[PDB]
């Protein structure tokens, strides 16, 4: 038997008695008292009992002599017991302490502080003194056990249910008590050779465990070592059910098991912080929960951004080490975090599985601010809930094949040498991420550029295939601050693999998918851009196939020299392929090689460049989809240039196409569309060497503000099997509103053609050069201009209308309708040419023109010129009409013409009409009316040979001015053998009536002449006249 000796009460009021050799009793009366002891030793079988007024009653046993306290017996108390021994304290095997609160400390506490309930411990300890616990230390519910020393070891068991267990190794330890319980502990001050080791069991269920070790040196020496069992089961305490701290120095080598489970609710919170933290093979940190997983933190918080947890410098997870935060029955999985600031080597297993009967998967983050070695396995799958996430973040990360990276975990591994990283560049095994996609867990990889001067620019490099042949729908997002260089397939056969190769929100890098890095998603999305963050990211692509199957492919990014560039042979199969690009000097979209963008629903390409081209396709690119839309804007270049001396652009729309841009320069294209439609709004468009076939309506609208022609077609064959072509050109400059050139053929066999050209200023209207073969069931050409021509067909033009042809023009000073070339306007039912002018001519046929139809109706108005003018010293105008012909205007001048008609009718209302050198045949009546108000002739016929097979020639001239009312001159021949000839001439002033000169042969059945003049000759047959009639001849005048 050995009981403490030298007991002397220094403060407070209490008695010390020894009723037996093995029994020692202390009676406490005051709330606080300090007792100084020469030696505090309890032998085996000896009992030291405290008799205290309450559970909050306070007793202190400060050892002031002897050596290390040797406690082998049982110490029991109804209140709080504090033992201070600078020489250290040892609890042997079988020793038991059971108090309402117990503190063992090697640091002395002043008496004045103690009576004032100020529990602070600092200094006064013997160098190297340790507190070793091999027995059992237990307390009542709400009790606490604290061991603060230079070194603390617990090879026995410690049990503080519902309270706090604190093992600190620091110079100054501050304890805050209230109402007999422990509220907080303040641990500060580094000490030499600090260490707190726990090889036994510590259970603080529904409480907290703090194992803080603040060391002065230990560059690589063990400052904290837990190899036993630490249990803090219960409710998820926000301060953490288990909290470790390695201080600013040392290595926290943990080999035991930490448990913060909750069978009935949410698991506890486990936090492990320090400088260097290594978890051994047997580490079993578990934070599972019945109603949802807890939380685990190794080296810091999420992304290291939690201010309550120190960020570790290096964290190593040896193979076989396990952290489990998965839900057990039903609920969401917890969070497991591995953060370091320099180097993280991870080889262990992390479980963040959701509840089996319900709940989503947890989240796992394995990120290092410097070098990252993630080679272990992670499981955040959910049997019923959504997939979990395995997040990674390093300086720069490169995916590698397999795990044969000469890792140093257990073989040829001296102790704490794993804290010396060797593999520069944050390699990640593709095998790990392969299993992550295979087990229904998302993978997310980020970087972030470090300070300037390092080679860690924040890049991602895929140097290994990434596959997913099993599991439910998963995601995989790679968002770096540098490059997204991909040089390996990312395939998925089973399920969906939604790839998002994003750039960082403030990234200044680019995305390159080359070396035939095919990405198959078996229905998953691919979003290589960001979407709208104005994130400057180039998307270079070379022999990369993007198969989305049933997913949607969206690429976005802005590149000053090249927004999105395509090279080699690319294939992109998806429900919707949406390309969006921007540039400043280069091409916003630049497809150089073969690009086969096979889509089922919609292709959309969008671009905008200040000086370069928005959309610039020069490759052998094929784009087949239901709806393809190319929208671009360019200030100095081209919105949509597809020009290429060798490359051909094939477009196949099952439904319709729409292209928009400032200038749309299409070229060498072969487009099949449902309802094609361009729209250029700045610099017009150009269709050259294309064969654009569309089942239905085509709408080519374009406006040009430059000298370039608005709708410039050259060697284009544009057909509409069932619809109509409607073109709408507008030129505000000295260009042409609509310019047709070269071998152009337009077919609208069941529809219409409407070429509308609105000139401005000196601009001409619609233009025709070369050979233009427009075939349609209805042709309509509309033009409007001021000084140039509203409508002009200088070049050969062929028009075949099953129903009719209509031309309309309005020219202020130029010619409204001008035909200075071989025009062959064949039509079945009707042809009408309407024009109007102020200074120039309304209709001016010059070249060799033939206008075949059943019905021809010309009309025009001119203030000072000639409305209907058909004359050339070489050109011959032929009009072939089965039924009536009508010509109406102010002046009608027909020369060198050869007209055939069923019926015929001129009508001159202002300037009279002139027919000369013509051959006009019309079976039925040839009524010619003309009224002139100037000195020009009313009806002026010369060298004309007019024939009426079955009809009657009728001329009716009125000249209010002094011109000839009806003047016939030269070789005029009139055959009306079956009808009547009636020429009526009304002169005024000094004007004559009917004037006959030259040689006029008027043959008919009945010949009637009528004249009316005031001062002139009513009828004046000056030259040779010859009238042959079979019934009678009538002449009258005044």
């Amino acid at each position: 038997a050995n009981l403490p000796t030298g007991g002397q009460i220094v403060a407070g009021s209490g008695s010390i008695q020894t009723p037996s050799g093995n029994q020692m009793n202390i009676h406490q009366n005051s709330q606080n008292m300090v007792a100084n002891w020469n030696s505090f030793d309890i032998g085996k079988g000896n009992t030291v009992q405290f008799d205290q007024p309450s559970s909050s009653a306070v007793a202190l046993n400060r050892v002031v002599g002897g050596g290390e306290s040797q406690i082998m017996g049982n110490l029991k108390a109804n209140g709080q017991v504090f033992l201070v021994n600078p020489n250290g304290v040892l609890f042997g095997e079988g020793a038991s302490v059971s108090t309402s609160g117990f503190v063992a400390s090697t640091r002395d506490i002043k008496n004045d502080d103690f009576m004032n309930r100020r529990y602070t411990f600092s200094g006064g300890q013997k160098a190297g003194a340790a507190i070793v616990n091999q027995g059992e230390l237990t307390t009542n519910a709400g009790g606490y056990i604290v061991l603060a020393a230079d070194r603390v070891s617990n090879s026995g068991t410690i049990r503080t249910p519902g309270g706090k267990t604190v093992l600190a190794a620091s110079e100054r330890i501050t304890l805050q008590l209230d109402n007999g319980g422990l509220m907080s502990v303040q641990v500060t001050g580094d000490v030499v050779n600090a260490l707190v080791e726990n090889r036994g069991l510590v259970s603080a269920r529904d409480g907290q465990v703090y194992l803080t070790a603040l060391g002065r040196g230990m560059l690589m020496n063990t400052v904290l070592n837990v190899s036993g069992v630490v249990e803090a089961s219960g409710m998820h305490r926000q301060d953490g059910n288990i909290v470790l701290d390695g201080g600013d120095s040392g290595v926290v080598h943990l080999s035991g098991t930490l448990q913060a489970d909750n069978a009935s609710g949410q698991g506890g919170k486990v936090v492990v912080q320090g400088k260097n933290i290594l978890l051994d093979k047997g580490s079993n940190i578990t934070a599972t929960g019945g109603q949802g997983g807890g939380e685990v933190y190794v080296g810091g918080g999420w992304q290291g951004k939690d201010s309550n947890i120190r960020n570790a410098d290096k964290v190593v997870m040896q193979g076989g080490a396990r952290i489990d935060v998965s839900a057990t029955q039903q609920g969401n999985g917890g969070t497991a975090v591995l953060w370091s600031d320099s180097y993280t080597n991870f080889h262990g297993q992390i479980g963040a599985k959701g509840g089996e009967t319900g709940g989503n998967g947890g989240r796992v983050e394995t990120s290092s601010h410097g070098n990252l070695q993630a080679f272990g396995t992670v499981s955040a799958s959910a049997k019923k809930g959504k997939a979990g996430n395995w997040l990674l973040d390093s300086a720069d990360i490169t995916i590698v094949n397999g795990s044969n990276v000469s890792k140093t975990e257990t073989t040829q591994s001296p102790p704490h040498t794993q804290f010396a990283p060797t593999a520069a560049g944050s390699a990640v095994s593709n095998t790990s991420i392969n299993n992550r996609l295979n087990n229904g867990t998302s993978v997310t990889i980020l970087t972030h550029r470090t300070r300037t001067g390092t080679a860690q620019g924040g890049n991602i490099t895929v140097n290994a295939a990434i596959n997913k042949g099993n599991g439910s729908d998963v995601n995989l997002t790679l968002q770096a601050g540098g490059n997204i260089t991909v040089n390996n397939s990312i395939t998925s056969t089973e399920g969906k693999l939604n790839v998002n190769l994003s750039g960082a929100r403030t990234s200044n890098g680019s995305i390159t998918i080359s070396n035939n890095a095919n990405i198959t998603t078996n229905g998953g999305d691919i979003t290589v851009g960001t979407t709208n963050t104005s994130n400057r990211v180039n998307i270079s692509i070379n022999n990369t196939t993007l198969n989305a199957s049933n997913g949607n492919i969206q690429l976005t990014g802005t590149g000053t020299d090249s927004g999105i560039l395509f090279a080699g042979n690319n294939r992109l199969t998806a429900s919707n392929i949406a390309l969006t690009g921007n540039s400043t000097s280069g091409n916003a979209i630049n497809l150089t090689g073969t690009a086969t963008l096979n889509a089922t629903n919609n292709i959309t390409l969008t671009g905008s460049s200040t000086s370069g081209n928005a959309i610039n396709l020069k490759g052998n690119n094929t784009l087949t989809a239901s709806n393809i839309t190319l929208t671009g804007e360019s200030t100095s270049g081209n919105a949509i240039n597809h020009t290429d001396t060798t490359g051909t652009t094939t477009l196949n729309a099952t439904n319709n196409i729409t292209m928009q841009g400032t200038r749309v320069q299409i070229k060498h294209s072969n487009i099949t569309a449902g309802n094609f439609a361009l729209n250029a709004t700045v610099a017009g468009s150009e269709i050259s060497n294309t064969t654009l076939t569309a089942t239905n309506n085509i709408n080519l609208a374009a406006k040009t503000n430059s000298a370039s022609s608005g709708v410039y077609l050259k060697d284009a064959r544009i057909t509409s099997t069932n619809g109509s072509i409607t073109a709408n050109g507008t030129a505000t400059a000295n260009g042409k509103a609509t310019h047709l050139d070269g071998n152009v053929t337009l077919n609208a066999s069941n529809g219409r053609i409407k070429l509308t050209g609105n000139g401005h200023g000196s601009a001409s209207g619609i233009l025709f050069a070369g050979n233009n073969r427009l075939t349609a069931s209805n042709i309509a050409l509309t033009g409007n201009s001021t000084s140039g021509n509203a409508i002009n067909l200088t070049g050969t033009a062929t028009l075949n209308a099953t129903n009719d042809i209509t031309l309309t023009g309005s020219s202020t000073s130029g010619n409204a309708i001008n035909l200075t070339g071989t025009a062959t306007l064949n039509a079945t039912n009707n042809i009408t040419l309407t024009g109007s002018s102020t200074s120039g001519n309304a209709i001016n046929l010059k070249g060799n023109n033939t206008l075949t139809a059943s019905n021809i109706t010309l009309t025009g108005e001119s203030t000072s010129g000639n409305a209907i003018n058909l004359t050339d010293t070489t050109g011959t105008t032929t009009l072939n009409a089965t039924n009536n012909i009508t010509m109406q205007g102010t002046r009608v001048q027909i020369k060198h013409s050869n007209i055939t008609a069923g019926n015929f009718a001129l009508n001159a209302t202002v300037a009279g009409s002139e027919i000369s050198n013509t051959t006009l045949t019309a079976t039925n009546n040839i009524n010619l009316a003309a009224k002139t108000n100037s000195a020009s002739s009313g009806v002026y016929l010369k060298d004309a040979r007019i024939t009426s097979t079955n009809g009657s020639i009728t001329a009716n001239g009125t000249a209010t001015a002094n011109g000839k009312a009806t003047h016939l001159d030269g070789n005029v021949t009139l055959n009306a053998s079956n009808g009547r000839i009636k020429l009526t001439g009304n002169g005024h002033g000094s004007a004559s009536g009917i004037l006959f000169a030259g040689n006029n042969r008027l043959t008919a059945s009945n010949i009637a002449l009528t004249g009316n003049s005031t001062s002139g000759n009513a009828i004046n047959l000056t030259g040779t006249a010859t009238l042959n009639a079979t019934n009678d001849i009538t002449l009258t005048g005044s």
Epitope: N758, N784, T786, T808, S810, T834, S836, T859, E861
Partner: antibody, heavy 116, light 106 residues
Framework: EVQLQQSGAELVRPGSSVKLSCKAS????????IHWVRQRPIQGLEWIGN????????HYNQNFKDKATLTVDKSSSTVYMHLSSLTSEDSSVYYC???????????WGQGTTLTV | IQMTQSPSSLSASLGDRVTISCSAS??????LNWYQQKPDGIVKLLIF???SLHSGVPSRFSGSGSGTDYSLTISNLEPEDIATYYC?????????FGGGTKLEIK
């Protein structure tokens, strides 16, 4: 000369309807579109809509989209402006104009008074 | 598209160089007509396009400008000119008009 003859003064109670006429002569009726411009009292001019007699194609200002309607009779060379649900606010002088495309409103009608 | 006129009214003397500036809400290229409405109510077209005379236009009328600013100038003022000069844009649908500038004599 090219003339744009309209109807005389038209006065109705608010909430009524009036069909304004724009009769054109001296030019090819199907060679230019007819315009419709309102001069609000002491507030500046405003455009209502146009109809092209060639095909009766119409473009309407959105403000008058439910307020006005245009009809054309090529036989009489006349374009008729229809209105509905008139108020005192719309009481103004309504002009019809001969619009080409590049020459725009080179001739205006005499204008009718629509007091409502 | 909204049209701007300034000044809303102007007073000057016979034969004085008259300038009616007409600023636009944006660059309308040259889609500008200068209608002159006589006080009776007859509305003509004087300068279709930025500077392009109409038929019944005396040589005194002449415009200029590009982009957002345009001006119409009557070189010699005579009492026929007294009217309100609505500058009209027609670049963008719907077409709009200016605020009117009455040209009063002094």
């Amino acid at each position: 000369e090219v003339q744009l003859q309209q109807s005389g003064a038209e006065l109705v109670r608010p909430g009524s309807s009036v069909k304004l006429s724009c009769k054109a002569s001296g030019y090819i009726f199907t060679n230019y579109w007819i315009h419709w411009v309102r001069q609000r009292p002491i507030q500046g001019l405003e455009w209502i809509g146009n109809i092209d007699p060639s095909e009766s194609e119409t473009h309407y200002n959105q403000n008058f989209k439910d307020k006005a309607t245009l009809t054309v009779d090529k036989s009489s060379s006349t374009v008729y402006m229809h209105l509905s649900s008139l108020t005192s606010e719309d009481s103004s002088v309504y002009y019809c104009a001969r619009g080409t495309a590049v020459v725009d409103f080179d001739y205006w009608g005499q204008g009718t008074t629509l007091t409502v | 598209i909204q049209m701007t006129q300034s000044p809303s009214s102007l007073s000057a003397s016979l034969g004085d160089r008259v300038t009616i500036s007409c600023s636009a809400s944006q660059g309308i290229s040259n889609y500008l007509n200068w209608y002159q409405q006589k006080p009776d109510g007859i509305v003509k077209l004087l300068i279709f396009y930025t500077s392009s005379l109409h038929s019944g236009v005396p040589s005194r009328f002449s415009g200029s400008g590009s982009g957002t600013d345009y001006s119409l100038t009557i070189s010699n003022l005579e009492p026929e000119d007294i009217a309100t000069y609505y500058c009209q844009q027609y670049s963008n649908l719907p077409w709009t008009f200016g605020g009117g500038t009455k040209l009063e004599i002094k």
